[PDB]
């Protein structure tokens, strides 16, 4: 629980979602001042922000955005460390000169964060390029844990009972059975990779969610982005394995990405 007197907010909205807005601020730490990004709420939204805060409090990894704390003032606020370069999709739309090697570096970082989330038995449920935040052009972190869930000790998936879902990033078992696991987040990671190598283009352009479900059920998949290495398109296709049981987990994905990244680092030198 943070002290509102130690928080200074800038009026400009950096971005927004259903929850409310994201604003820049400054928080007075024990000695240094820390630049922060603050989610400010516009019943359900409050409980959802507190649950998001409860998830973030449990996470500690270099590739996951750190929560500083929460504050109840003019509205409920979730204060995070600031990722100065903002969302990855917007960044790549604006910086088309970012190299294939640099994209591999960033998505590999996302895979390391996801490997940690999987080991931690949390499901993200909103893994998309808009939710990867850049600290620098060479350092990505995962944010936006509003749909995330801590798996029960006796289950490897979360069963949704009820909603407004990011359907183009969801695996077939999410749509068909409402079952969310770390393997479902792997499918989303495949879509995130496609977005990254497409420089922030939207996936399944011009298609309704129902048309996407129909396409995937026919065994069809999005094509290879221009300039995307064959090895990376191969990995996207493996993430898009229909049967959740034969789809790789994040330890297998991160290892494949790590090895290819070292190969490219070797080709560069
Ligand atoms: N820690 C953070 O910086 C941070 N964390 N989460 C989120 N969530 C957003 C929700 C709304 C949609 C985008 C995101 N998914 N936005 C953060 N910053 C941020 C937003 C927007 C612009 C900029 C420029 C620098 N930073 C920006």
Curated annotation (Swiss-Prot):
Residues given in the record as ATP binding sites: 14-22, 39
Domain of life: Eukaryota
Modifications the protein undergoes after translation, according to the UniProt entry: Ubiquitinated by CBLB after BCR activation; which promotes proteasomal degradation. Autophosphorylated. Phosphorylated on tyrosine residues by LYN following receptors engagement. Phosphorylated on tyrosine residues in response to IL15.
All copies of domain Protein kinase, residue ranges: 8-262
Tissue specificity: Widely expressed in hematopoietic cells (at protein level). Expressed in neutrophils (at protein level). Within the B-cell compartment, expressed from pro- and pre-B cells to plasma cells.
Subcellular location: Cell membrane; Cytoplasm, Cytosol
UniProt comment concerning the protein's domains: The SH2 domains mediate the interaction of SYK with the phosphorylated ITAM domains of transmembrane proteins. Some proteins like CLEC1B have a partial ITAM domain (also called hemITAM) containing a single YxxL motif. The interaction with SYK requires CLEC1B homodimerization.
Function: Non-receptor tyrosine kinase which mediates signal transduction downstream of a variety of transmembrane receptors including classical immunoreceptors like the B-cell receptor (BCR). Regulates several biological processes including innate and adaptive immunity, cell adhesion, osteoclast maturation, platelet activation and vascular development. Assembles into signaling complexes with activated receptors at the plasma membrane via interaction between its SH2 domains and the receptor tyrosine-phosphorylated ITAM domains.
Protein name in UniProt: Tyrosine-protein kinase SYK
Organism of derivation: Homo sapiens (Human)
């Amino acid at each position: 629980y943070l002290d509102r007197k130690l928080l200074t907010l800038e009026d400009k909205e950096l971005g927004s979602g259903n929850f409310g807005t994201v604003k820049k601020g400054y928080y007075q730490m024990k000695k240094v001042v820390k630049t922060v990004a603050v989610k400010i709420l516009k019943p359900a939204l409050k409980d959802e922000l507190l649950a998001e805060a409860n998830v973030m409090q449990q996470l500690d990894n270099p590739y996951i955005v750190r929560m500083i704390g929460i504050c109840e003032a003019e509205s409920w606020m979730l204060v995070m460390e600031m990722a100065e370069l903002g969302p990855l999709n917007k960044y790549l739309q604006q910086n088309r000169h970012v190299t294939d090697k640099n994209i591999i570096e960033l998505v590999h970082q996302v895979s390391m964060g996801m490997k940690y989330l999987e080991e931690s038995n949390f499901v993200h449920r909103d893994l998309a390029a808009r939710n990867v935040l850049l600290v620098t052009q060479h350092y990505a972190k995962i944010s936006d844990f509003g749909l995330s869930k801590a798996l029960r000790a006796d289950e490897n998936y979360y069963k949704a009972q009820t909603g407004k879902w990011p359907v183009k990033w969801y695996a077939p078992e999410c749509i068909n059975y409402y079952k969310f696991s770390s393997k479902s987040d792997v499918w989303s990671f495949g879509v995130l990779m496609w977005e990254a190598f497409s420089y922030g283009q939207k996936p399944y352009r011009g298609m309704k969610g129902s048309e996407v479900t129909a396409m995937l059920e026919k065994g069809e998949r999005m094509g290879c982005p221009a300039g995307c290495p064959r090895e990376m398109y191969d990995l996207m296709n493996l993430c898009w394995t229909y049967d959740v049981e034969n789809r790789p987990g994040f330890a297998a994905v991160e290892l494949r990405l790590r090895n290819y990244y070292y190969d490219v680092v070797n080709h560069h030198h």
